[PDB]
Design a protein around this ligand. Structure first.
Ligand SMILES: [Mg+2]
Ligand SMILES: [Zn+2]
Ligand SMILES: [Zn+2]
Ligand SMILES: [Zn+2]
Lengths: 552, 271, 112, 178, 107, 171, 87, 97
RNA sequence: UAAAGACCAG
DNA sequence: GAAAGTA
DNA sequence: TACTTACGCCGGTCATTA
């Protein structure tokens, strides 16, 4: 994992502290500027321009380069870069909150609309629960639409007390696509679009004690931060390309949408530095907000799916995490794994309850890393000589010096003098405990540990009474097997989830495996008063019982 | 959903059943602290029958010629008849058994007497018997104290919780209430002698197991009962090959788990 | 009384079917739907909208808004949840992990 | 690295490390209030040379002792000899640091007797000055109160010139000869 | 305790949290025609002295948030006139163990 | 200056060393890893004290591999230098740029320009020297310096010092 | 804090070793013997670490301690020795 | 093959803690990133070789750790960052309890 | 190598 | 397409 | 009072593509 030693102390994660990125941090953390929307070709020459993807960020090419760091492809995680947007833009995700936060603070001055002076407010301001509190404070302030100058104190309602003041009626705000529009009113309304710059600023003035009251955080996430200024550029590892040989493209979906954001950006800025036909610059600003909004969420209410020339909608980052098949649920709550095998199953009335016949073909593939101990040097050496193609054998030797000898090529396979502390990846052998399972897996019992029994033919062979638990027939069902890779993992399998252990189930305080089909229908007959057995047979019937005290 | 909803629930090292916040969902797992796989459907005799039959069974009157332990059953037969001090304990017993009978009829209003409880006491005795080759012919050698005091003493060992404070201790007595009614139900002086001719040895044995067995039945701190229950409910919902007319089955459970308002069938029964 | 019915009810859906479930499973369910105060549902609306940590919650129904609403109100996930550790790739505090294992140096000499 | 007895919760804003100067503003990991191995306030432990010559020596010895319980089953120029031996029998040998420190320490110690070195301590200790000073005063040969107050600025308004002048006198006496 | 017949004015019910410490409750006659606590399904609750409670929390190493909660407007919660913080001890018959201890704190 | 600081290390032991005399192997590892170490946070670690009672505590068995992780609590004698600390040591090197004085495990450097002017460099002498109307400074000469600043470098600490103020210089 | 280490007596958990504690001790112990750790029993024939592990546990010669956490963070320590191994 | 959600729930049911971590890590993802002890970020410019670590921006080179998390998560994190969200990862706890 | 789709297994 | 929670 | 929003059960082969 990660490979190559690191003097760094290794600990586990104990807390995940969520928060929002302050623009000043992004700049700090960044390792590349990122000005050019192109990807590479130092004038068609294949490399990477100091412009987009790797102006010192991650890498490509199994080319150790990477701003000293080196290490190469696997090992170097990503290195972020930045991109100084030309104008403040919302963050699709927080449009809802920005809206509601404004409705809570008066513009122009930037202060709550209900001090401790107001009663009902006090109640809310007491509510310990960042989220439920902001929830309330809003219901009260949305309604208030004037930044009162003086409120009748908690005494006589005739004399009015002083607080902050600036009458400025507060515009009922509303949503239009990605814009917040408000309609003031004094004496018909006065409609005007609240600008980002404008709202960003009000926020920058919201009192530290006022964030907080409105579920925020002085260190980790102040409202003003829901407005992107400097944009973090994820490194190659996040949006890898695809290199079909030499003379061929391969840029990821995300790499295109950044180029778009970068393009749409250069556009704007160059306009505010030139013939700035004002109310035409804003035409170009809405664009920037469209991409920076789209690059994140691209399944918004005001439809315009932002399609890639080819009709395809362009995978928004959000898209990447949305459940099932998506990052969280598809890559973490569950994932494809190594040391696994699957194949058609078939019953076998000659395997003990807790075994599982495993096709040799499969046993010669799945391995187990046993460590060279004096307790087994001999055996292991035998398996190694034995090679990777005979059965009772092995297919990899790993010396302390992290490097694996491939027994099917290493010019010294027939050789090799093991070494205590070395590791031999050997074949699955009879009795290795393994996890056997049939899907859908809705039982602890749909996954049980079994003893391996390597056998001929290509099917997983399993004892009938263990049928029900998995709920399998032999009309073509397949079943998968997982081989534990560590000494304690097997112990966990054998000691906790072995089939024998799972016989009487909590599911309903009774056994979940009994006798079935042949044996059942047949055990009845064998029993009937009528049924008598004569010596010649009785003698065999007795011998079959593996325990029999040998006492006719 | 059932799963994702209970993932994080497990029995902690204190027997409490909490989620990933330490919020208590059940003070003692399943209201008894017992592991499901260690429970069988036994029958609490005491519950049913006529008050008449109940008496003919558990009552022992050393002060009445016709209602004493015949000296055949016991070895200290004749010398116990009329013992006022023994008939004090022997009463205490019967007055408890009756208490129970009331309490059970309280709990299981129905009268239903077959409920799953740890330690199958019947088998434990069955073994006791043809393990010692007990003949329903000879007289036991149990003191009336032996029986009464042993059973009374055993219960002191059926530990589910182990706090050395009053709150916990009460909790303990609670969690064991029903098991005990079962225990006293089957280890009543009359029975232990007239029914199963247990001998002092056998008895000392039965008692010993009931204990061990019990202790083994308590749930293990670790048991992810969350998922277990999720799957235990969830699984049989998959096997649902779907006044009588009332929402039911899958569509109904979907109703319930959703705590939906308007339900297809919203009846109500008035007695 | 609610909890009493909620169970009677769940119990009857599994009863009609003619199957059996040890009381404890239905109970643990019913009690969960109940502790908080009322009738939290096994729904993106009920249970998954509690104090349990972001990462947990985000692994069902509303994945991304949950993660956004998280960095915005700067929550802190302490990781006592299975899901937290699964996502982090660490041994969760489950069965084999509900406790720790120490080498007692003293007893390591008593033996020899 | 080696974690030290103080856990200041570094929440993001990691920036404020002041100037380290004899304004007695030393690292955070060197304040007056320290926290003991068993979790108890303990005042900073500052050593003047020689006193630290003994400390090291003592332990270096006591160590050589236990080093053999397990093997069961005077004169400046002369000590740089006797010590260089103890080292090569209880040290990693590559500890050029400890070797150098031991020579420096031996060659510049102002008190060679655990008795004299205790007097010095008792003496100074009655001042109430900060450990840093009480150490400097102990390891820096100063005549006028000025020479002292000048090389140990931290002092200046803490003790009168006469007072500090007395102490400086008492020190020149205890000042073990050689 | 003020028992009204059909209803009071939002004007009137708005002068209750006005005489602290003393507190005021308000029941509608219809709501009392039947005592719900006499119901087949309603388990006997019990208020706990702020001592009985502080103990409970000690003997289970709980904070208040870790306790099952009962709603302030909860029928029985009203019956006993609970208060935000007051803990109730519910005792119900169990088909698993006969008797079961259960605590609920107030909202 | 020189202090006695209560520190703490963390050693991960392989299962192989789960011997009868393990504590002894740990203590020895500690010593290898601390004595002679150097940080900016603690300065120069010189000598681990009170050997016989180095607290070992119970180790945690790491889950995937079988190693045990120990949090060894010790107490040692350290040497962290500071600005304004007046310290005297012996000269070691000496060039046309100034001389390097050795104080303890450390080395303080004096810039020709942080010495009085009267004191000039002398190349034609051996060993190379710096002379003054009355003083003469070279390799062997003891000097009392005033540390102007430090610079923590990997496994060490350096500083620059002057002897231009009063009461500093040769002794 | 270690104001959290519940003193030996006053311990209130279970006298018996849970299934996981044992599954986990046998595994850990195997994992260490499997790593050439020193064994504390006569491996009378034995050559498989889990086997050896089980034997150690049997003669209560496993130098390990189970640290049991209570939902509040406080914890009780138990020796593989003290622990009753009914299971 | 896929050790999916439901298979995961089963190991959880069994209480097979380690075996679960084995499937998810050793037998699939598992990567080793370097964290900064101050900001819980994956910024550390570690060059395991010249032993240099650094974290300009937090300016470090000292308080630094390494961790073993599933690469899929290293991704999840760098992605929550691209969306301007900070999933700071910390080696010790504070909140207590 | 990566998508989106159709068909199909239990 | 159905059902449940905000402007 | 009507409008807005999340979601959906758990391996294999072939065809086509801005
Ligand atoms: Mg089938
Ligand atoms: Zn790099
Ligand atoms: Zn204003
Ligand atoms: Zn950093």
């Amino acid at each position: 994992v990660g490979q190559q030693y690191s003097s760094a102390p290794l600990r586990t994660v104990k807390e995940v502290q969520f928060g929002l990125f302050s623009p000043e941090e992004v700049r700090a953390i960044s390792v590349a500027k990122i000005r050019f929307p192109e990807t590479m070709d130092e004038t068609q020459t294949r490399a990477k321009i100091g412009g987009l993807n790797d102006p010192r960020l991650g890498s490509i090419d199994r080319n150790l380069k990477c701003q000293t760091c080196q290490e190469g492809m696997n090992e170097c995680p990503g290195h972020f870069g930045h991109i100084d947007l030309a104008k403040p833009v919302f963050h699709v995700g927080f449009i809802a909150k920005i809206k509601k936060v404004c409705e809570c603070v008066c513009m122009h001055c930037g202060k709550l609309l209900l001090d401790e002076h107001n009663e009902l407010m006090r109640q809310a301001l007491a509510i310990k629960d960042s989220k439920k509190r902001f929830a309330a404070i809003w219901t009260l302030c949305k309604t208030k639409m004037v930044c009162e100058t003086d409120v009748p104190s908690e005494d006589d309602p005739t004399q009015l007390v002083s607080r902050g003041g600036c009458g400025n009626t507060q515009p009922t705000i509303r949503k239009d696509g990605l814009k917040l529009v408000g309609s003031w009113k004094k004496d018909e309304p006065e409609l005007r679009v609240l600008s980002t710059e404008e709202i960003l600023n009000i926020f920058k003035h919201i009192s530290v004690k006022d964030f907080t009251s409105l579920g925020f955080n002085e260190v980790f996430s102040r409202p003003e931060w829901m407005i992107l200024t400097c944009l973090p550029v994820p490194p190659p590892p996040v949006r890898p390309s695809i290199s079909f040989n030499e003379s061929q493209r391969g840029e990821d979906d995300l790499t295109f949408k950044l180029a778009d954001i970068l393009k749409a950006n250069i556009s704007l800025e160059t306009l505010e530095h030139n013939g700035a036909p004002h109310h035409a610059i804003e035409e170009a600003e809405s664009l920037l907000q469209f991409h920076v909004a789209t690059y994140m969420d691209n399944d918004i209410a005001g439809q315009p799916q932002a399609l890639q020339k080819s009709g395809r909608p362009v995978k928004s980052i959000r898209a990447r995490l949305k459940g099932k098949e998506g990052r969280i649920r598809g890559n973490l709550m569950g994932k494809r794994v190594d040391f696994s095998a699957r194949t058609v199953i078939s019953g076998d009335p000659n395997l003990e309850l807790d075994q599982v016949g495993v096709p040799k073909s499969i046993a010669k593939t799945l391995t187990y890393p046993e460590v060279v101990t004096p307790y087994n040097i001999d055996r292991l050496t035998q398996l190694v000589r034995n090679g990777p193609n005979e059965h009772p054998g092995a297919k990899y030797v790993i010396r302390d010096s992290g490097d694996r000898i491939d027994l099917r090529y290493s010019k010294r396979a027939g050789d090799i003098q093991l070494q205590y502390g070395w590791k031999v990846e050997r074949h699955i052998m009879d009795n290795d405990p393994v996890l056997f399972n049939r899907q859908p897996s809705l039982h602890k019992m749909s996954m049980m540990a079994h003893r391996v029994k390597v056998i001929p033919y290509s099917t997983f062979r399993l004892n009938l009474s263990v049928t029900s638990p998995y709920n399998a027939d032999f009309d073509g069902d397949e079943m998968n097997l997982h081989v534990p890779q560590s000494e304690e993992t097997r112990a966990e399998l054998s000691q906790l989830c072995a089939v024998p252990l799972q016989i009487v189930s909590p599911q309903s305080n009774k056994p979940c495996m009994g006798i079935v089909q042949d044996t059942l229908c047949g055990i009845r007959k064998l029993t009937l008063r009528d049924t008598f057995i004569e010596l010649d047979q009785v003698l065999n019937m007795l011998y079959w019982v593996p325990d029999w005290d040998g006492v006719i | 959903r059932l799963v994702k909803a209970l993932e994080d629930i497990m029995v902690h090292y204190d027997n409490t059943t909490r989620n990933s916040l330490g919020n208590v969902i059940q003070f003692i797992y399943g209201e008894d602290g017992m592991d499901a796989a260690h429970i069988e459907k036994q029958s609490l005799d005491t519950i049913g029958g006529s008050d008449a039959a109940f008496e003919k069974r558990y009552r022992v009157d050393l002060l009445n010629t016709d209602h004493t332990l015949d000296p055949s059953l016991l070895e200290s037969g004749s010398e116990i008849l009329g013992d006022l001090k023994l008939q004090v304990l022997l009463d205490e017993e019967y007055k408890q058994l009756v208490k129970d009978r009331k309490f059970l009829r309280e709990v299981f209003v129905d009268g239903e007497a077959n409920w799953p409880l740890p330690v199958n006491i019947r088998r434990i005795i069955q073994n006791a018997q043809q393990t010692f080759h007990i003949d329903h012919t000879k007289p036991s050698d149990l003191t009336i104290k032996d029986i009464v005091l042993g059973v009374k003493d055993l219960q002191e060992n059926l530990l589910v919780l182990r706090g050395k404070n009053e709150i916990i201790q009460n909790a303990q007595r609670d969690a064991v209430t029903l098991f005990c009614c079962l225990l006293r139900s089957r280890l009543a002086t009359r029975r232990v002698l007239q029914e199963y001719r247990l001998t002092k040895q056998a008895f000392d044995w039965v008692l010993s197991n009931i204990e061990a067995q019990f202790l083994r039945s308590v749930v293990h701190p670790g048991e992810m009962v969350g998922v277990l229950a999720a799957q235990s409910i969830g699984e049989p919902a998959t096997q649902m090959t779907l006044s009588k007319k009332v929402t039911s089955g899958v569509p109904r459970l979907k109703e319930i788990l959703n705590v939906a308002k308007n339900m297809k069938t919203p009846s109500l029964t008035v007695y | 009384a609610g909890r009493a019915a909620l169970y009677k009810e769940v119990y009857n859906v599994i009863a009609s079917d003619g199957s059996y479930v040890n009381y404890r499973h239905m109970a643990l369910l019913v009690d969960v739907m109940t502790t908080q105060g009322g009738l939290t549902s096994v729904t993106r609306h009920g249970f998954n909208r509690s104090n349990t940590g972001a990462l947990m919650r985000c692994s069902f129904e509303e994945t991304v808004e949950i993660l956004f609403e998280a960095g915005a109100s700067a929550e802190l996930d302490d990781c006592r949840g299975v899901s937290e550790n699964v996502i982090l790739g660490q041994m969760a505090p489950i069965g084999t992990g509900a406790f720790d294992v120490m080498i007692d140096e003293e007893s390591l000499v008593k033996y020899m | 690295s080696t974690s030290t007895f103080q856990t200041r919760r570094r929440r993001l804003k990691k920036v404020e490390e002041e100037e380290n100067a004899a304004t007695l503003q030393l690292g955070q990991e060197f304040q007056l209030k320290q926290i003991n191995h068993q979790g108890e306030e303990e005042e900073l432990i500052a050593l003047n040379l020689s006193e630290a010559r003994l400390v090291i020596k003592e332990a270096l010895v006591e160590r050589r002792r236990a080093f053999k319980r397990s093997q069961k089953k005077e004169t400046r120029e002369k000590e740089l000899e006797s010590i260089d031996v103890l080292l090569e029998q209880t040290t990693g040998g590559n500890n050029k640091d400890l070797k150098n420190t031991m020579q420096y320490l031996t060659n510049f110690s102002r008190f060679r007797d655990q008795e004299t070195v205790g007097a010095v301590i008792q003496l100074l200790k009655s001042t109430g000055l900060h450990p840093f000073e009480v150490a400097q005063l102990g390891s820096l040969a100063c005549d006028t109160a000025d020479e002292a107050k000048t090389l140990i600025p931290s002092l200046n308004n803490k003790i009168s010139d006469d007072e500090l002048e007395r102490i400086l006198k008492e020190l020149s006496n205890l000042e073990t000869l050689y | 305790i003020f028992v009204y017949q059909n209803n009071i004015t939002p004007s009137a019910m708005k002068l209750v949290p006005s005489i602290p410490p003393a507190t005021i409750e308000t029941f509608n006659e219809a709501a009392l025609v039947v005592n719900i606590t006499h119901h087949e399904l309603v388990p006997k609750h019990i208020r706990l002295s702020s001592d009985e409670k502080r103990e409970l929390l000690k003997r289970y190493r709980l904070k208040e948030s870790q306790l099952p909660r009962i709603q302030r407007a909860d029928p029985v919660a009203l019956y006993l006139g609970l208060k935000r913080g007051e803990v109730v001890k519910i005792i119900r018959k169990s088909e698993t163990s006969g008797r079961y201890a259960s605590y609920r704190i107030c909202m | 200056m020189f202090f006695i600081k209560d520190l703490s290390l963390n050693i991960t032991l392989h299962p192989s060393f789960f011997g009868p005399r393990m504590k002894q192997y740990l203590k020895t590892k500690l010593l290898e890893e601390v004595e002679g170490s150097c940080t900016g946070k603690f300065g120069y670690i010189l000598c681990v004290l009170d050997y016989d009672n180095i607290d070992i505590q119970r180790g945690r068995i790491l889950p995937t591999d079988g190693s045990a992780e120990f949090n060894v609590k010790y107490r040692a004698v350290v040497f962290k230098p500071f600005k304004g600390e007046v310290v005297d040591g012996t000269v070691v090197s000496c060039s046309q740029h100034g001389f390097e004085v050795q104080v303890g495990p450390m080395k303080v450097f004096v810039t020709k320009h942080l010495m009085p002017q009267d004191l000039t460099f002398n190349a034609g002498s051996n060993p190379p020297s710096y002379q003054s109307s009355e003083d003469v400074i070279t390799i062997k000469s003891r000097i009392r310096v005033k540390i102007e600043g430090c610079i923590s470098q990997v496994s060490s600490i350096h500083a620059i010092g002057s002897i231009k103020e009063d009461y500093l210089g040769a002794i | 804090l270690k104001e959290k280490a519940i003193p030996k007596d006053q311990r209130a958990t279970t006298p018996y070793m849970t299934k996981y504690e044992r599954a986990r001790i046998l595994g850990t112990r195997a994992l260490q013997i499997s790593m050439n750790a020193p064994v504390f029993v006569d491996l009378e024939g034995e050559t498989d670490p889990l086997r050896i592990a089980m034997k150690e546990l049997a003669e209560k010669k496993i130098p390990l301690v189970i640290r049991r956490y209570l939902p509040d963070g406080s914890f009780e320590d138990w020796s593989v020795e003290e622990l009753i191994v009914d299971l | 093959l896929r050790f999916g959600e439901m298979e995961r729930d089963c190991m959880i049911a069994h209480g097979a803690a380690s075996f679960l971590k084995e499937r998810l890590m050793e037998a699939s993802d598992a990567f080793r990133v370097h964290i900064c002890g101050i900001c819980g970020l994956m910024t550390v410019i570690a060059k395991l070789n010249h032993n240099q670590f650094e974290c300009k921006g937090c300016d470090n080179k000292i308080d630094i750790y390494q961790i073993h998390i599933p690469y899929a998560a290293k991704l999840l994190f760098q992605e929550l960052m691209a969306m301007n969200i900070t999933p700071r990862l910390y080696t010790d706890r504070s909140r207590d309890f």
